[PDB]
Amino acid sequence: FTCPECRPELCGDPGYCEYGTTKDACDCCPVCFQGPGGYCGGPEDVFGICADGFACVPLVGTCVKIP
Amino acid sequence: FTCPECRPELCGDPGYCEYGTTKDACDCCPVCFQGPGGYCGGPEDVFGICADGFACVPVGTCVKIP
């Protein structure tokens, strides 16, 4: 899948989020940061996007802090 | 592609969901429904998931079903 045109108005809302905020893979809309040890990866990072200092690790993977 | 099994306790918090709660793509993590007019679908509904009585309308937008 390649991303069709974005419109800032359309985006839903993730609510407040503890670890950070960031845009969607094509960079269109904001979503929340996955915490440490929480689901991530998947097609289009649907399962999460790791907060800064953390990297998605598979066995789809999970957020773990790098050195 | 397909889903691996998961740890329920793991899945991150989705927040208070004005339109309601549903399950994962892998049927594991809880998720909030997209409201009316909000972004809808894409690969695996990554973009959104329209609430019962609401349909993806082209990617697409949730539009109330009469």
UniProtKB/Swiss-Prot annotation, chain B:
Chain positions carrying an annotated carbohydrate: T2
Major localization class: secreted
Keywords noted in UniProt: Disulfide bond, Glycoprotein, Immunity, Innate immunity, Secreted, Signal
Any GO CC annotation of this UniProt entry: extracellular region
Any one GO biological process: regulation of cell growth
Cellular compartments annotated: Secreted
GO molecular function: insulin-like growth factor binding
Entry annotated with the keyword Cell membrane: no
Keyword Ribosomal protein: no
Annotated S-S bridges: C3-C26, C6-C28, C11-C29, C17-C32, C40-C56, C50-C62
Tissue expression pattern: Expressed in hemocytes.
IGFBP N-terminal domain segment(s): 1-65
Function according to Swiss-Prot or TrEMBL: Has a role in the innate immune system.
Note: Does not reveal bactericidal activities against E.coli and S.aureus.
Record-given protein name: Single insulin-like growth factor-binding domain protein-1
Organism encoding this protein: Cupiennius salei
Residues represented out of the complete protein: 20 to 97 of 97
